[PDB]
Design an enzyme around this catalytic site. Structure first.
Site, mmCIF file in Angstrom:
data_model
loop_
_atom_site.group_PDB
_atom_site.id
_atom_site.type_symbol
_atom_site.label_atom_id
_atom_site.label_comp_id
_atom_site.label_asym_id
_atom_site.label_seq_id
_atom_site.Cartn_x
_atom_site.Cartn_y
_atom_site.Cartn_z
ATOM 1 N N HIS A 79 79.635 -0.825 41.969
ATOM 2 C CA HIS A 79 79.741 -2.437 42.674
ATOM 3 C C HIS A 79 80.947 -1.802 43.558
ATOM 4 O O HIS A 79 81.979 -3.406 43.707
ATOM 5 C CB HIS A 79 79.529 -3.705 41.615
ATOM 6 N N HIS A 119 77.360 -10.893 47.701
ATOM 7 C CA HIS A 119 77.042 -10.961 45.938
ATOM 8 C C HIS A 119 77.423 -10.968 44.642
ATOM 9 O O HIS A 119 77.564 -10.643 43.620
ATOM 10 C CB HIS A 119 75.212 -11.152 45.991
ATOM 11 N N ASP A 120 78.533 -9.242 44.968
ATOM 12 C CA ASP A 120 79.738 -8.975 44.282
ATOM 13 C C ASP A 120 80.939 -8.829 44.959
ATOM 14 O O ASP A 120 81.395 -8.191 43.558
ATOM 15 C CB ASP A 120 78.666 -7.684 43.907
ATOM 16 N N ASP A 237 69.076 -6.376 45.039
ATOM 17 C CA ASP A 237 69.651 -6.385 43.512
ATOM 18 C C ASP A 237 69.700 -5.082 43.313
ATOM 19 O O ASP A 237 69.697 -3.648 42.993
ATOM 20 C CB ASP A 237 70.178 -7.520 43.142
ATOM 21 N N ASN A 240 66.994 -0.016 43.960
ATOM 22 C CA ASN A 240 67.702 1.322 44.057
ATOM 23 C C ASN A 240 66.005 2.367 43.537
ATOM 24 O O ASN A 240 66.485 3.150 44.331
ATOM 25 C CB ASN A 240 68.688 1.698 43.223
ATOM 26 N N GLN A 288 66.514 5.735 32.642
ATOM 27 C CA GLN A 288 65.878 5.580 33.946
ATOM 28 C C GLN A 288 64.127 4.697 33.805
ATOM 29 O O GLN A 288 63.765 3.889 34.095
ATOM 30 C CB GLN A 288 65.747 6.245 35.063
ATOM 31 N N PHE A 291 64.431 1.366 31.868
ATOM 32 C CA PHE A 291 64.492 0.640 33.197
ATOM 33 C C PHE A 291 63.253 -0.050 34.345
ATOM 34 O O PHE A 291 63.298 -1.531 34.206
ATOM 35 C CB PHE A 291 65.879 0.558 34.285
HETATM 36 O O1 LIG Z 1 70.787 -1.840 39.983
HETATM 37 C C1 LIG Z 1 70.802 -1.115 38.465
HETATM 38 C C2 LIG Z 1 70.435 0.795 38.335
HETATM 39 C C3 LIG Z 1 70.308 1.606 39.611
HETATM 40 C C4 LIG Z 1 70.105 2.495 39.463
HETATM 41 C C5 LIG Z 1 70.471 3.514 37.909
HETATM 42 N N1 LIG Z 1 70.277 2.323 36.899
HETATM 43 C C6 LIG Z 1 70.257 1.392 36.944
HETATM 44 N N2 LIG Z 1 70.550 0.277 35.907
HETATM 45 C C7 LIG Z 1 70.249 1.246 34.435
HETATM 46 C C8 LIG Z 1 71.264 2.374 34.372
HETATM 47 C C9 LIG Z 1 71.363 2.735 32.708
HETATM 48 C C10 LIG Z 1 70.486 2.749 31.384
HETATM 49 C C11 LIG Z 1 69.577 1.332 32.111
HETATM 50 N N3 LIG Z 1 68.363 0.808 31.085
HETATM 51 O O2 LIG Z 1 67.766 -0.075 31.601
HETATM 52 O O3 LIG Z 1 68.672 1.371 30.010
HETATM 53 C C12 LIG Z 1 69.268 0.618 33.814
HETATM 54 C C13 LIG Z 1 70.680 -0.974 36.061
HETATM 55 O O4 LIG Z 1 70.876 -1.387 34.965
HETATM 56 N N4 LIG Z 1 70.573 -2.191 37.251
HETATM 57 C C14 LIG Z 1 70.312 -3.498 36.896
HETATM 58 C C15 LIG Z 1 72.674 -3.685 36.733
HETATM 59 C C16 LIG Z 1 73.219 -2.892 38.130
HETATM 60 C C17 LIG Z 1 74.308 -3.495 37.245
HETATM 61 N N5 LIG Z 1 74.880 -4.140 36.056
HETATM 62 C C18 LIG Z 1 74.713 -5.070 35.496
HETATM 63 C C19 LIG Z 1 72.783 -4.037 35.482
HETATM 64 MG MG LIG Z 2 76.244 -9.020 40.747
HETATM 65 ZN ZN LIG Z 3 74.932 -6.134 43.028
#
Ligand SMILES: O=c1c2cccnc2n(-c2cccc([N+](=O)[O-])c2)c(=O)n1Cc1ccncc1
Ligand SMILES: [Mg+2]
Ligand SMILES: [Zn+2]
Length: 331
Positions: A79, A119-120, A237, A240, A288, A291
């Site tokens: 961030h 935003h961050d 947001d 990625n 991932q 996610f």
């Molecule tokens: O954009 C990404 C993100 C982008 C790239 C890689 N991984 C990401 N992950 C992530 C990381 C570890 C585990 C999990 N999961 O769902 O189990 C998701 C995430 O949560 N976000 C959203 C997020 C970003 C920052 N804070 C909270 C959530």
């Molecule tokens: Mg945020």
């Molecule tokens: Zn963000």
């Protein structure tokens, strides 16, 4: 001299991809002397003619942008200003999708881009829950409710008051009130606790989707317009995993670095370690895939439906990256 330095020329050439998904954003960060947010915002403002439209002095814009960027923390792995620049640029691309041609006003465009930039800002690299559990002053101020997201807004707006930073100095009160409301509505919607509701309403919108022959989207009221803008920045947001794998893996490494750091702080404090923050008990590949399947693919599939067929390649890339990570899970 009047001519660009060679580094500046190489930077300018990279910025020719500002309108493309998968811009080399980390290279731009390096070539610009860690000014990705300033250079990307300036390029986009010039490209969309926002300085002329909103009578923004150029020195005021650069001063505000540098100030905003300076309030992202260089020590925070994910961030930070590079993430801000990426979300800005991704929003910039989504705004220009065929399905949305001529839909949004210049003020609405300004709102989406400014919201993305701020935003961050001033993110400490820990979650809302960490700030709540430690009885942080921030959590006390904001009553444990969208603590960070409220703070990012307050800081983004507050910095306008620094010397030669008020980029909205020539907007009318009507324009400022409208801009402010839109920006607030967009940034507060980036709290991940709002995701499911946000997605629910996007689905309902797709269900009732209306289009004007030669089919750009039709949006008749503020509620529909702001809903699309909120989901657009939320998609940016969470963009990625939709980028080329080389970029996506860099983002994953960064967010895991930030998360594991929070876990280390939780551990040393005797707190329960937050989900995904335990470096001794992680399943990066499994996580991932989860996610993507539970959060990112559902969101983007719905967006792709809204702007069908504009987002097909983005969705194809997401599905390729999902399969890569899936194939990489050790059994
Ligand atoms: O954009 C990404 C993100 C982008 C790239 C890689 N991984 C990401 N992950 C992530 C990381 C570890 C585990 C999990 N999961 O769902 O189990 C998701 C995430 O949560 N976000 C959203 C997020 C970003 C920052 N804070 C909270 C959530
Ligand atoms: Mg945020
Ligand atoms: Zn963000």
């Amino acid at each position: 001299f009047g001519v660009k330095t060679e580094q500046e020329d190489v930077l300018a050439k990279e910025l020719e991809d500002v309108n493309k998904w998968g811009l080399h954003v980390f290279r731009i960060a390096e070539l610009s002397g860690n000014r990705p947010l300033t250079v990307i915002m300036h390029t986009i403002f010039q490209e969309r003619d926002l300085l002329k439209t909103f009578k923004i002095p150029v020195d005021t814009l650069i001063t505000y942008l540098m100030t905003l960027e300076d309030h992202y923390h260089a020590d925070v792995a994910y961030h930070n200003n590079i993430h801000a620049a990426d979300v800005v640029q991704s929003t910039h691309v989504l705004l220009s999708t065929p399905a949305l041609e001529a839909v949004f006003t210049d003020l609405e465009i300004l709102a989406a881009i400014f919201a993305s930039a701020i935003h961050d800002v001033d993110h400490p690299g820990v979650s809302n829950q960490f700030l709540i559990n430690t009885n942080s002053e921030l959590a006390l101020m904001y009553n444990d409710s969208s603590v960070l997201e409220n703070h990012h807004l307050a800081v983004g707006f507050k910095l306008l008051q620094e010397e030669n930073c008020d980029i909205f100095q020539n907007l009318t009160k009507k324009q400022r009130q409208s801009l402010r409301k839109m920006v607030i509505d967009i940034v507060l919607a980036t709290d991940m606790s709002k995701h499911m509701n946000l997605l629910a309403d996007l689905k309902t919108m797709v269900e009732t989707k209306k289009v004007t022959s030669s089919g750009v989207l039709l949006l008749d009221n503020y509620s529909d317009r702001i809903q699309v803008l909120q989901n657009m920045v939320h998609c940016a947001d969470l963009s990625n995993p939709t980028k080329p794998l080389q970029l996506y893996r860099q983002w994953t490494d960064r967010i895991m670095e930030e998360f594991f750091r929070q876990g280390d702080r939780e551990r040393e404090r005797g707190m329960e370690i937050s989900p995904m923050c335990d470096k001794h008990n992680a399943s990066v590949e499994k996580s991932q895939v989860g996610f993507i399947d539970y959060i990112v693919h559902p969101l983007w599939e719905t967006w792709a439906d809204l702007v069908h067929p504009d987002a097909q390649d983005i969705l194809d890339t997401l599905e390729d990256n999902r399969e890569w990570y899936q194939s990489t899970i050790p059994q």
